[PDB]
Amino acid sequence: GEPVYADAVLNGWLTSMGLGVEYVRAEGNTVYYLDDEGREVPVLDHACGFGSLIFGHNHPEIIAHAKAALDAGTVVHAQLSRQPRANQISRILNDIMRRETGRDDRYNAIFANSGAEANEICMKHAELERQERITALFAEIDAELDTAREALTTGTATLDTASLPLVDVDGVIADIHRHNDERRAERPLFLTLDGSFHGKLVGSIQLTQNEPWRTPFTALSSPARFLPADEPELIGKIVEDERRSVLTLSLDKDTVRVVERDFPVVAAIFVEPVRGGSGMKTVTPELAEELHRLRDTLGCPLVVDEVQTGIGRTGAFFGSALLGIRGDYYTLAKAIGGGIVKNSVALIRQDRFLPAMEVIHSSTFAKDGLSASIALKVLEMVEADGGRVYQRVRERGQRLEAMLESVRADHSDVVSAVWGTGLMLALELRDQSNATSQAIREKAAHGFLGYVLAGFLLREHHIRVLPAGPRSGFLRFSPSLYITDEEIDRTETALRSLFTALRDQDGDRLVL
Amino acid sequence: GEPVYADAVLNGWLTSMGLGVEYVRAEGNTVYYLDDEGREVPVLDHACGFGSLIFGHNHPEIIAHAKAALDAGTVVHAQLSRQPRANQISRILNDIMRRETGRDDRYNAIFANSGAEANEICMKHAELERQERITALFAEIDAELDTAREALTTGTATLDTASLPLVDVDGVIADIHRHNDERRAERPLFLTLDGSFHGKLVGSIQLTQNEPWRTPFTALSSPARFLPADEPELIGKIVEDERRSVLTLSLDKDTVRVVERDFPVVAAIFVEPVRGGSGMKTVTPELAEELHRLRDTLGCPLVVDEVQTGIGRTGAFFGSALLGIRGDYYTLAKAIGGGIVKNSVALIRQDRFLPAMEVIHSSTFAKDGLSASIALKVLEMVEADGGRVYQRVRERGQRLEAMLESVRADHSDVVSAVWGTGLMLALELRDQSNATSQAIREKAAHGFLGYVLAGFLLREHHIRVLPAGPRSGFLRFSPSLYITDEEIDRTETALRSLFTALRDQDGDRLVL
Ligand SMILES: Cc1ncc(COP(=O)(O)O)c(/C=N/[C@@H](CCC(=O)O)C(=O)O)c1O
Ligand SMILES: Cc1ncc(COP(=O)(O)O)c(/C=N/[C@@H](CCC(=O)O)C(=O)O)c1O
């Protein structure tokens, strides 16, 4: 019971899962902890900052560049001055997007400090677009009301009273204006997929499915409707239920009617090309086409969240390009910081970009000179040698996926599936809530199975894995492109060992 | 008409203000741009990352520490593992808070990536506290309804029908549950001061007064009520109008009555000890005591935003400690990154801290090992030599404030006031909307006066100043504690020159 100032509950919980270790040094695909006698134990890292480390921990080329930037007296804090590196970074991302999609679309860049901040720039810009559509619609309704009033107060037309259930000339117009103003102040909706993960700030948390992470915060901010990814059939009806109307007066020269017209409620659709919070499921072509339909139908942007799938993880720079997802806005973060600094970017198609956003949105630390320099280095590295790095991710991914499939095939009793693409892979664990072993069953029931299995992998095979998915029902594999054949073989051995113990329901070996 | 990929509108606007320059290098209180012939021109920086650079640009001690951390193979990405530096940082902040306030309160630390993200951790934890208060209140109401039902369906008591205007035993209870459920799902309120700046993300932007930055985003997220700082008289009534009731049945053995009870609407009160968005006005004792009364009365936390006032800027570590503001939660960011990295912290009093927050809140980049190491270095630097660094800030502050007051006294026709404390100072500019010069008048009317005057100071005196406040009506002075007497004299000369031109209404010299 000594004084503790952070992390007591987090550390207590990690210790009971068998993950209570302090990593003291890291290089490439290895993190080191200290044993009882103070010796470094190498651990293979398959978590890698939840896919931040495409080039591994502390890549010598990123470390050298960071030290050169610091020694050159880089201007980190140059707010409200010319920072051409921001334009230079956006130009490269623009060229890469054009090459990978064959589309000649141009994107404005706004920078931020995290994946959530980049997603929230997109939520804000989407709401600027919706307020533009609202202004246009309300201006038209004013004109339609003036024309209907001209016709009713001067002979021409008679107000049909069959339509009054939707609400005397002047009083009907007051009732319409009251109805419309209420509608206009209502919060918008966001559309996301089931299992969506888009961050955990006040805005972004509402876009994140995981119920214990989100539901306490429901009242703070605009909600999302979580569309069922597996059944595109059902999305149509869910979105149709969210339809809302404003009222106007329609003149048919003879008769004036109160009529409903459509109100823009949906600010944006968000999609991850490979769904982190769903256990690394790739968006199917059928779901891609439903998101395209929704975007074309509602006139709101489709925001492609590549915070995790970007910077080569899937075997292309953009996962969306690989899977044929045609977004209006794109977000990047994780790997762009080179595994050492914090940086993110929102790319917004220039034909939709509202110039006000460049001067009403800002952040102290955004576009800092240090992370700008490191971004340019990361982009040079991932693009080097005519795109060989993408090729390496693809062949390392194939080797790791083949190993995971080979393991699943011999352990189908405890492993249901392999998901993901390139170096963003996961094993789906079969439910263990009815497990013979009480200790395993108890942990599975509390949603901790993945964490317990991760602990086994650490203490018995010196491999760092973290679970994914809503009840730690998936094991994530997202190492660097430098993962060796030998490290893949040691992972295979570790998994056969883990899944043999799980088949045998050896609770004393698995749960501490 | 060439392709541009970032910052076209930002750069166009900075050029027209006379602030179109690229800083290529920075050291201490100097940023350098390149002249036509490629020579470095020294500019004195009074903006310093909006008060991020208490130790100046690229302090050798922070640069050396950052390079040592990178060369040691510091684990930047160690998510869901033991990271003791987080507890070590919180321990130091805890010890400093105790020393400066004489209170023996303990604080839990949650880390993030920006000042806004730290403020949003506080908004989220404040909403967890409100959901706890709501659960308790609704549990009591259930018990009160059961006891009232027992008494009405068995002789004891008669339902008084004088109270029914607030809504048959079973039907009155259904109407109460419907009323209460509607109330429970309503968005909360935040309380802030007029001129408040708390960040610009989906949640935090609602807490920021500046109307063009906020009003486009009104529909997204819980609003703030902006309390008038200068007239505490009026705060009582504004908060009293926001009172909301839930219903219950109160048994007085004899009679059962429908009665209103208080519902917790206000999630949190936010305050800056020195109000950045108000032109650096310090919170008065009278306003401090009104915020204390509101906090004690509503039972919500008082969140002290020290993103700008913290890490020694005001002549103490905590500005709140200096001005007697007794917060429940505190936020820090800017200077804690050493002017090179991105880091922030929310300190939440342990007697209020809800353990769920440690495991339902997270961020990829939060608590990274590199910014953790740099935080410890910054804390060691600001605390060194038994607090002499705070003494230095106070005597540099006095010297700079005295100079600004000396300038005001001879230029009261264009300068209305000096605001702030320690090294967080501003000049208030008198309104120039009636200026003789058309060019000046036009710029003042558009809210750009401060920016224009900043441009004069850059091109004619090689001094970087940025405006503050809602219509660039204040000039910010927030240099490093290394600001020399000579740099203060050059600033005095530059300001006499600027304010002499403004008195003379020399529009051709001031506006390009
Ligand atoms: C697809 C996607 N979108 C947004 C985010 C939020 O990025 P951050 O705010 O930098 O953590 C992320 C971060 N993802 C990690 C974050 C885990 C955590 O919150 O610590 C994960 O899924 O495990 C993301 O993956
Ligand atoms: C008192 C206070 N609270 C929160 C913030 C937001 O922190 P960040 O998200 O890191 O920009 C800040 C940032 N302040 C600067 C930054 C301006 C900007 O670039 O957005 C200012 O007042 O001008 C702050 O001062």
Numbering used by the authors:
A (entry chain A), B (entry chain B): 6 to 172, 178 to 522
Lines from the paper:
Previously, the biosynthetic pathway of the immunosuppressive agent caerulomycin A (CRM A) from the marine actinomycete Actinoalloteichus cyanogriseus WH1-2216-6 has been identified, and the critical role of the (S)-selective ω-transaminase CrmG in the biosynthesis of CRM A has been reported. CrmG catalyzes amino acceptor caerulomycin M (CRM M) transformation to caerulomycin N (CRM N). Moreover, the activity of CrmG is insensitive to inhibition from ketone α-ketoglutarate or pyruvate.
The crystal structures of CrmG in complex with amino donor l-Gln, l-Glu, or l-Ala in P1 space group were determined to resolution 2.35, 2.25, and 2.20 Å, respectively. For these three crystal structures, each asymmetric unit contains two dimers. In the structures of CrmG with l-Glu or l-Ala, clear electron density was observed between the N atoms of those amino donors and the C4′ atom of PLP, indicating that we have captured the external aldimine for these amino acids. In the structure of CrmG with PLP-Glu, γ-carboxylate of the l-Glu portion not only forms a hydrogen bond with S372′ but also forms an additional salt bridge with K210. Based on these three crystal structures, amino donors l-Glu, l-Gln, and l-Ala exhibit strong, moderate, and weak binding to CrmG, respectively, due to side chain differences. These corroborate well with our kinetic data that, Km value for l-Glu, l-Gln, and l-Ala toward CrmG is 80.02, 182.70, and 405.10 μM, respectively. Moreover, in the case of l-Glu, which forms stronger interactions with the active site of CrmG than l-Ala, the corresponding by-product α-ketoglutarate also exhibits very weak inhibitory potential with a Ki value of 145.9 mM. The energy profile for CrmG catalyzing l-Glu deamination was calculated based on the crystal structures of PLP-bound CrmG and l-Glu-bound CrmG; the energy profile for CrmG catalyzing CRM M amination was calculated based on structures of PMP-bound CrmG and CRM M-bound CrmG. CrmG catalyzing l-Glu deamination is an exothermic reaction with calculated reaction enthalpy of −33.5 kcal/mol, and CRM M amination is endothermic with calculated reaction enthalpy of 11.5 kcal/mol.
